[PDB]
Amino acid sequence: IQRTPKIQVYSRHPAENGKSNFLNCYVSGFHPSDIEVDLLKNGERIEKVEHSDLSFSKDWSFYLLYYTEFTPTEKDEYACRVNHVTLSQPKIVKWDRDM
Amino acid sequence: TYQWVLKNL
Amino acid sequence: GSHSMRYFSTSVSRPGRGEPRFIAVGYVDDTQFVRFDSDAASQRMEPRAPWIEQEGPEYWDEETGKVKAHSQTDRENLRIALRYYNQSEAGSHTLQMMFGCDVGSDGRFLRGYHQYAYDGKDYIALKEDLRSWTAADMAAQITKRKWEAAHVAEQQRAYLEGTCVDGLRRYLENGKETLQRTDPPKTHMTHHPISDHEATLRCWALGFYPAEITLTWQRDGEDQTQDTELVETRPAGDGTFQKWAAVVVPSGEEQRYTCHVQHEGLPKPLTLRWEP
């Protein structure tokens, strides 16, 4: 009984180039609770990433929010890398400002 | 306000 | 209107890497307000919402006492569970718990919860009458017989209808500014062409509180489920939530579609139509 994480990478506020915002990675619907979540800037791990306290939904599946303060630009590509026991390899989800 | 969770399975 | 209080705890064994980690979190509706982590340095129940800091020093001592006792109980329960399912002592196992209550607009008791899950699967749950147990499998059936004979549910019932409701009531008042607010969603529609024949319409709902919301697509005023994509409601990180609903439409037919947004912060549901 192991469930794979759903992943959403998005900003707190509508992205404007040159303005401070928050880059979020929402992982949910997973089991067991151990999970590896990084936020990447141009393929490189962002260092000061905070996360929410381990919690869960009605169906007992876990969720976490990983977030970092950032300033989007036109060049800079942001992503979230996720690893879990259910994944054969880490899953990379690119930040799409329209999603 | 938390509950007293004392009983065993 | 109606309000809830929930406590969620997770105990995860890690054989060879010391005792199980215990993490507990408390929520009023969709606002977290406390946490306890057995691996943290403080060894105290910690505040996670500004309005819970107005509780006196005796609350933090009492609540720390309670969450530490639950930490010890669920460590034992992890051992009892191995024995019941005849599992190896070397593997990693998970014991989760949820308890709490639901109150009306008058701050009066509506429903109570007290339930376990072992390795992400329903173990034992207190039924709505607060007198009986829903045991899911054979192992849970053993606990059920033990708890029914010892009349344990009366202790749950006294908590859920009393202490739970009083705490929830006091929290709603102390954090009125936060918890009793309604942040309606800020809505908008975007257009994204696929081919010369197809386009995606994405209906957005942002900055809303509480988390409950419904987004629906209709074509010619008739409900539309086909060609629809709905993401899970997600936290913005500032205490508000976000969600979007999308539909793949034929080109030139965009304006026949409408997005319907239901939120308790709204005086009426909003209807959105693509307007180039």
Author numbering:
A (entry chain B): 1 to 99
B (entry chain C): 1 to 9
C (entry chain A): 1 to 276
Source paper text:
We solved the structures of A/PB2549–557, the overlapping A/PB2549–559, and B/PB2550–558 peptides in complex with the HLA-A24 molecules at a resolution of 2.90, 2.95, and 2.16 Å, respectively with clear electron density for each peptide. The B/PB2550–558 peptide differed from the A/PB2549–557 peptide at positions 5 (Ile to Val), 6 (Ile to Leu), 7 (Arg to Lys), and 9 (Trp to Leu). Both peptides shared the same anchor residue at P2-Tyr and similar solvent-exposed residues (except for P7-Lys) but differed at PΩ (P9). As Leu possessed a shorter side chain than Tyr at PΩ, the IBV peptide was not buried as deeply into the F pocket, which may explain the lower stability observed for the B/PB2550–558 peptide (Tm of 57 °C) compared to A/PB2549–557 (Tm of 62 °C). Structural overlay of HLA-A24 presenting the A/PB2549–557 and B/PB2550–558 peptides showed that the antigen-binding cleft and both peptides adopted a similar conformation with an average root mean square deviation (r.m.s.d.) of 0.31 and 0.37 Å, respectively (for Cα atoms), consistent with T-cell cross-reactivity observed towards these two peptides. Structures of HLA-A24 with A/PB2549–557 and B/PB2550–558 showed that the antigen-binding cleft and both peptides adopted a similar conformation, providing a structural basis for T-cell cross-reactivity between these epitopes. In compliance with the in vitro data, the structural data support the potential cross-reactivity of CD8+ T-cells between the A/PB2549–557 and the B/PB2550–558, verifying our previous findings of broad CD8+ T-cell immunity against influenza virus infections. Likewise, cross-reactivity between Vic lineage and a variant found in the Yam lineage was also observed with the PB2550–558 variants (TYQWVLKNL (variant 1, both Vic and Yam); TYQWVMKNL (variant 2, Yam only)) in the virus-expansion system, but 3/4 donors did only respond to v1 after peptide expansion. The superiority of IBV at inducing cross-reactive CD8+ T-cells in contrast to IAV was validated with the reverse experiment, where virus-expansion with B/Malaysia/2506/2004-infected C1R.A24 cells induced highly robust CD8+ T-cell responses in 4/4 donors, capable of cross-recognizing all three different epitopes.
